[PDB]
Amino acid sequence: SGPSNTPPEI
Amino acid sequence: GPHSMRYFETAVSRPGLEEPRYISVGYVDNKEFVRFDSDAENPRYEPRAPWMEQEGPEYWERETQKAKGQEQWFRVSLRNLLGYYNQSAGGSHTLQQMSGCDLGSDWRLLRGYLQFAYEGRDYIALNEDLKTWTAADMAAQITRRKWEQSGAAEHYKAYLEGECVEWLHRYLKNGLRTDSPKAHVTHHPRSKGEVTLRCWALGFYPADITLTWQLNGEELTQDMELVETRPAGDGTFQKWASVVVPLGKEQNYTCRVYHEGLPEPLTLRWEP
Amino acid sequence: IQKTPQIQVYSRHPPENGKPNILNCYVTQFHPPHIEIQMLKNGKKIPKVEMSDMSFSKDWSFYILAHTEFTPTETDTYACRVKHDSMAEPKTVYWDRDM
Ligand SMILES: [Cl-]
Ligand SMILES: [Cl-]
Ligand SMILES: [Cl-]
Ligand SMILES: [Cl-]
Ligand SMILES: [Cl-]
Ligand SMILES: [Cl-]
Ligand SMILES: [Cl-]
The missing domain is CATH 2.60.40.10 (Immunoglobulins)
Structure with missing residues (x-):
């Protein structure tokens, strides 16, 4: 189960 | 044994008003087990090992939803990176991510990973403590400041310690050989x-x-x-x-x- | 920074003249991921060469496996031509059954 990157983006 | 899961994510911008291509590949003990590719006809996560063919469509749908999330996060990141590096339009650029967990034979987290790269070079990476960031670059300092302000690490730590570990465990029971x-x-x-x-x-x-x-x-x-x-x-x-x-x-x-x-x-x- | 493809050409099974087999062209350590890979039989492009999906390694570099069905003979010579932006001219690596 993969990650869901939070904001903020890069 | 020293079991692991990884997700290897790539977005690649191309010239000529096109959206960036986004590909995510999931690995369990270095075997590719899932894959999502925005270039496909119906972008969705797919099983790439037969021991995944037992998950119901809610698994694929959940994962596919996350992928559309990542696509967008990667797409905006890519745009920011262009500006951070003072780079021209109509070029081709890559943002990559590695995520995942290492587990013991006692099922206990050993190490968590979260690393980004721009153009194939380290950009930023969550340290082993899962609290602090190592920025490779001038540009990445700005990203590091954002993520320190926001507490981003907390989010990634919870994922690496929780979901990553629990799901690695499940995928292994599903499968040694x-x-x-x-x-x-x-x-x-x-x-x-x-x-x-x-x-x-x-x-x-x-x-x-x-x-x-x-x-x-x-x-x-x-x-x-x-x-x-x-x-x-x-x-x-x-x-x-x-x-x-x-x-x-x-x-x-x-x-x-x-x-x-x-x-x-x-x-x-x-x-x- | 560009990174230059490393290439190995080799068969799936120990080669035996006249017995069908798979010839691999394993291309690694490259960046950017755009790449063109051809496999040649006696200097002429083999049609309909399979290409694996592309992946990348712990060091960020990309890799990919090209393959084709083939039946090695005593004299048929096989190669793998790679065009990539890290290199001025395309790299051709010839199959050596001993390697
Ligand atoms: Cl589920
Ligand atoms: Cl989402
Ligand atoms: Cl453009
Ligand atoms: Cl679970
Ligand atoms: Cl096959
Ligand atoms: Cl042949
Ligand atoms: Cl040539």
Whole structure:
């Protein structure tokens, strides 16, 4: 189960 | 054993008003088990191992939803990175991510990973503490400031310690299994009274393997030629190692193959 | 920074003249991921060469496996031509059954 990157983006 | 999961994510911008291509590949113990690719006709996560064919469509749908999330996060990131590096439009750029967890045989987290790269080079990475960031670059400092302000690390830590671990565990119950190398040594002329001996290992899984040459006991780390382990194309792997020896002296040289599928390391020599 | 492809050409099974087999062209350590890979039989492009999906390694570099069905003979010579932006001219690596 993969990650869901939070904001903020890069 | 030292079980692992990884997700390897890539977005690649292309010239000419196109959206960035986004690809995510999931690995369990270095075997690819899922894949999502925005270029496909219906972008969705797909099983890439047969032991995944037992999940219901809610799994695929959930994961596919996350992927659309990542796509967008990557797309905006890519745009920001253009500006951070003062780069022109109509170029081609890559943002990559690696995420995942290492587990013990007690099912306990060992290490969590989260690393980004821009153009194939380290950009930023969550340290082993799972609280602080290492920025590679000038640009990445700005990203590091954002993520310190926001507490981003907390989010990634919870994922790496929770979901990543729990799901790795489930995927493994869903699936240990190895193929031992078949080894042989081949003999190859050179000139100047010398001969190449080439110890081959074939048909082995997993891909981790060590090949040594001995001159009557002593290991030849130095004079030995290797090749990078390579896929046979059928799920298994190949490797060889070779030494140049004097002609007639062949029987003095012993190849050893070490692989976790083997009850003992294999030991072998040139057999005419 | 560009990174230059490393290439191995080799068969799936120990080659035996006249017996069908698979010839691999395993291309690694490259960046950017755009790449063109051809496999040639006696200097002429083999049609309909399979290409694995592309992946990348722990060091960020990309890799890919090309393959085709083939039946090695005594004299048929096989190669793998790689065009990539890290290199001025395309790299051709010839199959050596001993390697
Ligand atoms: Cl589910
Ligand atoms: Cl989402
Ligand atoms: Cl553009
Ligand atoms: Cl679960
Ligand atoms: Cl096949
Ligand atoms: Cl042929
Ligand atoms: Cl040419």
